[PDB]
Structure 1
């Protein structure tokens, strides 16, 4: 929304990008879940791409 060259309301420069705390077991479980879900999504995308290629060939 800010086009670089703007008066930029100096109201957000007084904050620290602090990352909230995290648990160990829950974080590892979620990491494995994300990895497997991304693997499945990439597999589905590859299947859709193969189907599109077959359609284009036909």
Structure 2
């Protein structure tokens, strides 16, 4: 793919993209679907983040992890 330095093509100098036609009925319905869709997915993401954060803490400072550490220290002594 081109780099910022490569010169622009002559053929494309006058290319003016014509935007798509909008259907009033389909546009509004689709816009709400996206809003509802992305609210649901953002809630799901917030639950998967908390799970990941809980597992890390549980391994670092969880009851079972801290119990094993003390057991190992005792057995050493």
> TM-score, with normalisation over the residues of structure 2?
0.64
**Higher Cα Rg: structure 1 or 2?**
2
Secondary structure at the aligned position of 2:28 is classed as helix
Aligned residue in 2 for 1:21 = 21
Report how far residue 10 of structure 1 moved.
2.2
Where do 1:1-58 residues align within 5 Å? Answer: 1-57=1-57
| 1:6-56 Cα shifts (integer Å, max 9, x gaps) | 243322222112211111111000000000111111111111101111111
Give 1 or 2: higher helix fraction.
2
Q: Which runs of 5+ in 1 are unaligned?
A: none
Count of aligned pairs = 58
Equivalents in 2 of 1:10, 1:34: separation in Å? 39
Q: Which runs of 5+ in 2 are unaligned?
A: 58-76
Moved over 6 A (4+): none
C-alpha RMSD of matched pairs (Å): 3.6
